[PDB]
Amino acid sequence: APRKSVRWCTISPAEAAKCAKFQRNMKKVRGPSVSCIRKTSSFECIQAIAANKADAVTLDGGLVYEAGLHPYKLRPVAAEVYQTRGKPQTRYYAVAVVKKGSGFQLNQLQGVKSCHTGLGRSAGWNIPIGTLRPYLNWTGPPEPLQKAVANFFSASCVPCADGKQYPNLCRLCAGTEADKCACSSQEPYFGYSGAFKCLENGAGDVAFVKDSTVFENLPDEAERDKYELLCPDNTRKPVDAFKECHLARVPSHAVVARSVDGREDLIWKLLHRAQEEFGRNKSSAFQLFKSTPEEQDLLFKDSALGFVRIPSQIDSGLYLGANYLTATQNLRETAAEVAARRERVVWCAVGPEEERKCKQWSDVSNRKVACASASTTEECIALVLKGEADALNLDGGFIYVAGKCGLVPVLAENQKSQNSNAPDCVHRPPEGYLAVAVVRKSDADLTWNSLSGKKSCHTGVGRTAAWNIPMGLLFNQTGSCKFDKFFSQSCAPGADPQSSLCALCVGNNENENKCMPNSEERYYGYTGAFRCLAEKAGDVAFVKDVTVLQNTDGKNSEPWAKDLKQEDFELLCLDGTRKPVAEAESCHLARAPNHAVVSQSDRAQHLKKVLFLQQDQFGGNGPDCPGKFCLFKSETKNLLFNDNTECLAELQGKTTYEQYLGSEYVTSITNLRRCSSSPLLEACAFLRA
Ligand SMILES: Oc1cc2cc[nH]c2cc1O
Ligand SMILES: Oc1cc2cc[nH]c2cc1O
Numbered sequence: 001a002p003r004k005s006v007r008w009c010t011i012s013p014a015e016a017a018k019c020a021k022f023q024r025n026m027k028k029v030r031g032p033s034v035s036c037i038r039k040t041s042s043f044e045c046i047q048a049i050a051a052n053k054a055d056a057v058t059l060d061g062g063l064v065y066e067a068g069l070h071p072y073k074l075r076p077v078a079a080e081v082y083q084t085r086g087k088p089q090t091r092y093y094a095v096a097v098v099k100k101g102s103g104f105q106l107n108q109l110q111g112v113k114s115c116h117t118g119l120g121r122s123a124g125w126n127i128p129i130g131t132l133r134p135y136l137n138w139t140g141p142p143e144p145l146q147k148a149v150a151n152f153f154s155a156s157c158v159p160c161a162d163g164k165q166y167p168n169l170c171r172l173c174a175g176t177e178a179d180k181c182a183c184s185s186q187e188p189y190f191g192y193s194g195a196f197k198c199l200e201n202g203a204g205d206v207a208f209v210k211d212s213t214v215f216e217n218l219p220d221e222a223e224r225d226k227y228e229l230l231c232p233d234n235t236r237k238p239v240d241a242f243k244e245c246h247l248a249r250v251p252s253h254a255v256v257a258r259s260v261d262g263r264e265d266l267i268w269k270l271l272h273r274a275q276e277e278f279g280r281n282k283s284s285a286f287q288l289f290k291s292t293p294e295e296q297d298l299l300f301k302d303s304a305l306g307f308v309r310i311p312s313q314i315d316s317g318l319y320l321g322a323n324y325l326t327a328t329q330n331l332r333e334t335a336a337e338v339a340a341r342r343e344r345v346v347w348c349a350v351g352p353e354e355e356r357k358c359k360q361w362s363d364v365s366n367r368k369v370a371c372a373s374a375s376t377t378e379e380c381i382a383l384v385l386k387g388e389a390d391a392l393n394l395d396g397g398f399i400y401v402a403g404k405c406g407l408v409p410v411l412a413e414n415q416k417s418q419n420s421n422a423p424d425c426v427h428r429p430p431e432g433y434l435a436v437a438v439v440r441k442s443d444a445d446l447t448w449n450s451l452s453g454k455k456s457c458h459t460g461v462g463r464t465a466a467w468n469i470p471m472g473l474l475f476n477q478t479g480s481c482k483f484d485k486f487f488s489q490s491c492a493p494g495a496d497p498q499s500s501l502c503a504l505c506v507g508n509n510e511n512e513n514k515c516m517p518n519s520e521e522r523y524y525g526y527t528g529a530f531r532c533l534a535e536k537a538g539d540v541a542f543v544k545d546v547t548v549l550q551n552t553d554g555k556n557s558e559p560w561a562k563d564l565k566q567e568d569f570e571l572l573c574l575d576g577t578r579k580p581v582a583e584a585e586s587c588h589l590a591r592a593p594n595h596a597v598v599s600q601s602d603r604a605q606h607l608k609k610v611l612f613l614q615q616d617q618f619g620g621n622g623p624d625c626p627g628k629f630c631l632f633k634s635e636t637k638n639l640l641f642n643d644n645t646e647c648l649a650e651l652q653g654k655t656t657y658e659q660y661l662g663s664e665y666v667t668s669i670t671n672l673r674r675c676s677s678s679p680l681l682e683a684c685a686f687l688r689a
């Protein structure tokens, strides 16, 4: 029945004492118990935590990063919330603070004395350094980064630095004998405030700190006017201009925990009670976000408003974002490794069969294109958000998820439409495809209004033609979220493997990976969902009109297809009727947006460039198409892009998922969400909040 205490790791005596005050006040309020373990630096608590010696520790974005690394695999449980000078936020601006009348600019630090929060921290190291990489005249990784800084700065206090090999990096540190350059509050120059005192006490000329630091230490506006900030556009602006004069915007510190059996609910229950009982002016007996004047930021970040629970999918990589990761990862990569990655385009292939095609597209492009892969479409968007992939072609349904995660549509799939197939394609207003309900002519008893308890074949959950358009329509007539109960049994890859929704699925050839939302499931996609119907595993397949058309009348020679005839098939019209597959225009459930390519708004223009080339070489009219590679072809398996794709067209203005998908469909997708929501969609609500 009972549940124990959260073991909090501490890094310095002053920190232990505060913890003790926290353990004392937790039990006196009869709330969750804590315990205090004692290590000497945050990296050690990372170690101490992964080794099940400790359970929690607040880390700076930069250490979150290090802690998420392999051997440790820790994850951010809760994010501290801060000032903002406005609305509270879980982010903050890194600044470089200097005294007025020092004359230099951001591009002149060569030979200046500098004070840092600590080795490896967002604002005190990772961020300033990566900004000065160009002036470091640094070989790259083989040569220790600390050697570059130790030569560039005349003497600095970067705590945690190897002051025995790099004395110049610890020289300015004020500390007793072995306390000097200590990686805890032992060295007075440690942390936001220590780096500030190192400046104001005249040991250093530039302070790499947080936006609040100057305000936390100089409460009187007159004091602050003796100070300024160096802006990356090589000018100086008042300390109050951080929104304008900053090196970068990092994510807030956060409490980390183990990935497996980390006791997340325990920690969270602790901190929640702690904000409620000792948060901002809740108490006087003990204040969570307050410290002793000697050493600041003990345990948490002083004067933080509280914490926010970090959703479960989120790992450090997703926590930090593309931007922060690229830069940290960029201080561990070669100048040539960096510029290579910025020029190529990493595509996220969903599953085995797409990764191979991608591999062919990689080779044939002479590596202007490279690949990354995942088992599901959500995992790929995660890759795109982490910054490990640049794009992927998505269905109207997942444009929504991507779009909710801050991703933008670059170019849209334009099927071999009908007007005048000349250079119209890339400028042809995309026109969409009609999703339909398809059943065999035979079962003539079947009508739209008799689908209840019948078997169903679905392209997949989350997707338009299938899931969203029919489930959205039925949910309007039945008023229920029990989606797995309308159809007796179904195959809809991506569902719960144990539900009726996954019953008719089939998996790959040796029957493995049943219901997996990818090509490994033979019944996955428009192709598979139609097959599901042909091979008589289901009674109604929700697909677009064209799907029946491209797999009947010997067009597809894959065994199950071969003998199929478009006459054997009919569509289920919303008004009870049934028309031949040729009547979709007057008998469809809806008109959906074409799939479209998506990327960060960052790479969309580069992404667009490489794509026009790639598609002119291997597109619908690519010289080397039949020849060596056909981007828009895959033997009916619709890999990477649909097989009837003529080219990738312009968005005609529709630059946001909202404009592209259109109002209705977006509202239709939100209505369905009242029932089910998705882990990515949630994680993205936190991340983009
Ligand atoms: O979460 C905390 C953990 C440790 C690590 C030691 N001091 C700490 C700071 C914290 O607030
Ligand atoms: O129907 C499609 C076909 C393939 C196969 C796995 N990748 C794809 C996803 C879809 O959008």
Ligand SMILES: [Fe+3]
Binding pocket: 060, 061, 121, 122, 123, 253
């Ligand atoms: Fe920080």
Ligand SMILES: [Fe+3]
Binding pocket: 395, 396, 463, 464, 465, 595
């Ligand atoms: Fe579709």
